[PDB]
UniProtKB/TrEMBL annotation, chain D:
The Gamma tubulin complex component protein N-terminal domain, residue ranges: 9-250
Designated name of the protein: Gamma-tubulin complex component
Gene: tubgcp2.L
Subcellular location: Cytoplasm, Cytoskeleton, Microtubule organizing center, Centrosome
Top-level taxon: Eukaryota
Family the UniProt entry places it in: Belongs to the TUBGCP family.
First-to-last residue of the parent protein present: 209 to 495 of 896
Classification of source organism: Eukaryota, Metazoa, Chordata, Craniata, Vertebrata
Length: 93, 263, 52, 250
């Protein structure tokens, strides 16, 4: 936890330590007081939000393509907690 | 149960299940023989059966696509446009089954939202094959001309794909006859039929006519008579058609002024 | 190890389509936070600021 | 006792799709435009009276499934056909909310009150969509008075911040064809109606009428402004658009 989140500041900001310190403070505060998910767990709802996003933008081909990509992610059987990963990538589109 | 979640997949491709059926042209309803306590989860999969029924009307259309050479030139160009949307319909069956083999169980209600986006698309292709029984060209142009005036924005997108490929043989006829004076017929699917009597050296004489009863509705009646005068003198994308026949009319009259110079 | 490489490739493809502007390094960190049971809502907010 | 709630939660979810229950059966009374549901006797009478609270959600759902059947049966090309296309969208996003609940019963659980407070965000949206659909069920309207009707309802709802947004998406998909045929009048004075979908109907100078089968936007005078622009071409904030659109083409 403590290390990974600091790593996040460091790669984005492109600065080492004692440069990212204040930013660290915001990040720590904001992650810690809301640590655990505040939504009911459900892979399907997040997926649907990603495909509607494709349709709304009229990128139909990519919306179908996406469906193939999510099955590939799921199939490998390595990453669990998948909804949160997907969720994040959708919020930042 | 899991065996039913798979079984509904096959009925999407229009392929009869692993249970006995007495439907395939009525809907695609399955009777297991213990359908009695499956009367709530058989009823969900009876709504999905009705999607597989609408797939089969498009499929039998495609058996009429190509014969030893099926009647029309536009009749089959239409059928090419209808097979493309069937092809895209297959794409979601091909992700759906590949989820039903990962390290499995996909919920009936989850897959219902997956079949809802095809259910506004395929249903309006099956409505579009109902207006047509004949394949004769220009009938098909009046079908998509009758369906792009209708409400609902979601099938209006779908018929605009189809407008672009139905119309494309109409326009391939049109621009050759305006510029050089040359024509194409294969079955008399152009709205110009040829030889009312017999051919006669040009001076403008009755040789072509509008042939209403197979006219594409893309043109209005005074604009079909305009492009007739243009073609004898040389001798929405529905509304882009009437613009450039006005720009054709000025280029063909220079040619008509050259005929005075020969006499 | 190999499945872990293949899986990351899938995720990179999920990223390109959505225009996130996350690199191979930024995505891998995000995943790791995500796997520890952090709320994605909070996580997205932090990221936006870090790009400022 | 916790078991009698669990299977009725599952039965309630089956009804909300639009599909017959195990212990909740559907009897048509008005032809399933409002369903007279009967849940059959259960041993525990407490769980049966709570189950009744959740069945009017499904009665209001039958109102909207007859709305999208209704406008298709007539084959309009009107903006009523497109009002239903929105209600099919609100109906596609609904189904994700039931199917989640369905997913939650598979592994893990939802009791009756766990049901109750998740349904509770959408029984209110259903009932606002249901009342726009029942007021419209008279076999009317054609283009302009559909629009007139939906504007009065948006100006009614004013001060409940809830229906301002929900009536916002409906009134702009309804206006999506309407501002097409509006432009055709203010820049060419020509009509584009498959039926009569534009208020100023036709039949130089020309023989224009207006009808109150296609009531003007909120005010009769701006429809009279568009009467007067089109002749010259031949020789809240939305009606406002017209008064200066006339007077730049005068």
């Amino acid at each position: 936890p403590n290390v990974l989140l600091q790593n996040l500041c460091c790669r984005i900001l492109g600065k080492g330590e004692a440069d990212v310190a204040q930013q660290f403070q915001y990040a720590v505060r904001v992650i810690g007081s809301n640590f655990a998910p505040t939504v009911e767990r459900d892979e399907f709802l997040v997926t649907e939000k990603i495909k509607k996003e494709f349709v709304r933008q009229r990128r139909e081909a990519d919306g179908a393509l996406f469906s193939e990509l999510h099955r590939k992610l799921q199939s490998q059987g390595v990453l669990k907690n998948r909804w949160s990963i997907l969720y994040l990538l959708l919020s930042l589109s | 149960e899991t065996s039913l979640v798979r079984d509904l997949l096959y009925v999407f491709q229009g392929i009869d299940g692993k249970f006995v059926k007495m439907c395939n042209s009525e809907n695609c309803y399955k009777v297991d023989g213990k359908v009695a306590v499956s009367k709530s989860l058989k009823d969900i999969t009876s709504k999905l059966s009705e999607l597989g029924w609408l797939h089969n009307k498009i499929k039998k259309y495609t058996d009429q696509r190509s014969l030893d050479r099926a009647f029309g030139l536009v009749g089959q160009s239409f059928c090419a446009a209808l097979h493309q949307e069937l092809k895209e319909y297959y794409r979601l069956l091909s992700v759906l089954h590949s989820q039903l083999q990962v390290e499995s169980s996909l919920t009936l209600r989850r897959l219902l939202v997956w079949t809802f986006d095809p259910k506004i698309r395929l249903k309006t292709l099956a409505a579009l094959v109902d207006h047509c029984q004949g394949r004769k060209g220009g009938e098909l142009a009046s079908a998509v001309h009758a369906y792009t005036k209708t409400g609902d924005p979601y099938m209006r997108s779908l018929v605009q794909h189809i407008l672009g490929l139905v119309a494309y043989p109409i326009l391939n006829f049109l621009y050759r006859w305006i510029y050089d004076g040359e024509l194409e017929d294969t079955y008399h699917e152009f709205f110009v039929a040829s030889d009312p009597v017999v051919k006669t050296d040009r001076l403008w004489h009755d040789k072509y006519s509008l042939r209403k009863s197979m006219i594409p509705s893309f043109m209005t009646m005074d604009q079909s008579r305009k492009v007739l005068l243009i073609g004898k003198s040389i001798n929405d994308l529905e509304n882009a058609f009437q613009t450039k026949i006005d720009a054709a009319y000025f280029d063909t009259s220079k040619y008509l002024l050259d005929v005075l110079n020969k006499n | 190890m190999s499945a872990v490489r293949e899986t990351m490739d899938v995720l990179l493809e999920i990223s390109r389509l959505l225009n996130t502007g996350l690199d191979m390094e930024t995505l891998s960190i995000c995943v790791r936070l995500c796997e520890q049971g952090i709320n994605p809502e909070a996580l997205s907010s932090v990221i936006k600021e870090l790009r400022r | 006792l916790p078991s009698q709630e669990t299977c009725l939660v599952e039965d309630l979810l089956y009804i909300l799709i639009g599909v017959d229950g195990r212990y909740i059966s559907v009897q048509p009374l008005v032809g399933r435009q409002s369903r007279s549901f009967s849940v059959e006797q259960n041993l525990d009478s407490s769980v049966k009276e709570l189950v009744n609270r959740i069945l009017p959600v499904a009665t209001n759902y039958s109102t909207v499934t007859r709305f999208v059947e209704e406008n298709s049966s007539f084959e309009y090309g009107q903006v009523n056909h497109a009002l239903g296309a929105a209600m099919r969208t609100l109906g596609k996003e609904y189904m994700i909310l039931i199917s989640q609940l369905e997913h939650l019963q598979r592994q893990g659980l939802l009791s009756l009150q766990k049901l109750w407070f998740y349904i509770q965000p959408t029984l209110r949206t259903m009932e606002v969509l249901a009342s726009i659909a029942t007021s419209l069920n008279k076999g009317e309207c054609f283009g302009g008075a559909t629009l007139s009707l939906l504007h009065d309802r948006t100006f009614g709802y004013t001060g409940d911040s809830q229906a301002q947004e929900l009536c916002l998406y409906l009134t702009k998909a309804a206006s999506a064809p309407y501002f097409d045929i509006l432009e055709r009048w203010i820049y060419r004075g020509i009509i584009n109606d498959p039926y009569s979908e534009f208020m100023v109907e036709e039949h130089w100078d020309q023989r224009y009428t207006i009808v109150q089968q296609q009531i003007p936007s909120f005010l009769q005078k701006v429809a009279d402004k568009i009467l007067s622009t089109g002749k010259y071409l031949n020789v809240q904030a939305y009606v406002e658009r017209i008064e200066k659109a006339y007077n730049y083409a005068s």
